[PDB]
Amino acid sequence: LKAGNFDVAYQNPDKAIKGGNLKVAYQSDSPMKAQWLSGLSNDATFATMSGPGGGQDGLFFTDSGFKFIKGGAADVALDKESKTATITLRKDLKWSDGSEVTAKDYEFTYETIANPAYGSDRWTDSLANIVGLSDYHTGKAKTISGITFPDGENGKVIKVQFKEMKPGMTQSGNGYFLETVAPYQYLKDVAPKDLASSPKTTTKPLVTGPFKPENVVAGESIKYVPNPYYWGEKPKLNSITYEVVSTAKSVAALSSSKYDIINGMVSSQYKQVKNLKGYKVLGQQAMYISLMYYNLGHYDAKNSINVQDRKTPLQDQNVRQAIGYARNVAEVDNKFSNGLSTPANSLIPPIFKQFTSSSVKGYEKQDLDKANKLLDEDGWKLNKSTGYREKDGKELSLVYAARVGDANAETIAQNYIQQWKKIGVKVSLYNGKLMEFNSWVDHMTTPPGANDWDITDGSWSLASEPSQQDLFSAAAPYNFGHFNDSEITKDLNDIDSAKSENPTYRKAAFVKYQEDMNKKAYVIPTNFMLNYTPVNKRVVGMTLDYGAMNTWSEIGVSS
């Protein structure tokens, strides 16, 4: 397996020993926040750090495209004719203290998120599709009617009843049902409003995974030891330590071999890591898309709809396409990215093999000729004196709300401005400078939207159900440019239709959607990304493969 020129796995030629201690770190300049309950946890650092303990007690295995498979802590089955998910817990799934994992423990997860008393921020409207749950959530019902237990609370089966099936329900991270358990018997006597701060969820939790946290140092570390009661295969290792390391201290740690594995390392550091003897640098395709938006209208909050009513040359498809073809993304990436940004052909990242295809053609290749032609034949005639094109007497001049963040943010934006000059388009930065992130979010997300930009950039970390509704639908607030297209609406609907319960059909729907978006060019896909992970050469069985379900059990060291 490769990801770009990166290997996904480190095939160590040396056998693992019995036992050993593995030293892992997460790169963060901010402290970890321990919270073992998924619903109550808001810290991304700690979520990752919880991996050896079961990842906040996730239940389902998946394939390498995040499609549910059988064989994890539990199984999930979907029955369309009855509108039901059936979650079947393993006969021998236990908590770390030996107690059984039961049907109640799954239901309890729902309570942690849905009952406001716990203070979760993790409710979503998707959950209102489960029967009874909105009513539980607003306090109208004392219980969640659509969640029933075929063999009772202390049984191993839960049935979840929906108002409508959704084809994304076969993908992990779909959000229509939840994927974790909480130890009801361990936590039942904790007042909901105290749950998040309790030892029992923070420093002294119960977990279901291969390791359990023997010690937790607030903000800093976990000491993992084997969890005797884990259902799967006994780990090779005796222990794992998992610590936060600052961005500034990371490279040093690798040089001294203080950590065998450092996760979360940033792209700008790669050139420093690449040459470290002692390490194998793995890579993997990220759940990420960056793109260019064009400003085409406004958002009507009251009526929850985007109206594509803005006066701008960008209303011309030819102009939208031309500004895309003019960019040199591939060139930019080759200069700056160290291989970790690669040109997107489409809006769905290639890690989603079941949802896209490299056959879809976008703006991944600069074509200045085509760009100049498109503009030519749309009446934007070059004004020889000025070096910029005009139509009906007005210059083709736009504002680019480029933003800070990327090590080479300033330089990249300048490159694009110059490319655009080449095709007779005059482009300037929003107020002559890059926008700060928080200013950019505000600018983009505040209804009804601003009229004082034309082009901007956005980037998303996608969930493992790569839903486009919330980014690009007519009703989405996050449709920053505010386009509204019947064909696009149709396409998006088809993707989430009953027909799309069939994977082949869904694939084709995703593909058509991607094609249509590139053609219409309301937005333009920019980059896909790779993540990297340095691994000490003594590590055995390490891999970034997203279908690898037992790495913490399999992983070892050769000495």
Binding site: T124, G458, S459, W460, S461, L462, A463, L471
Partner: peptide
């Protein structure tokens, strides 16, 4: 769901 980033 997705997140800025």
């Amino acid at each position: 769901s997705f997140a800025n980033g």
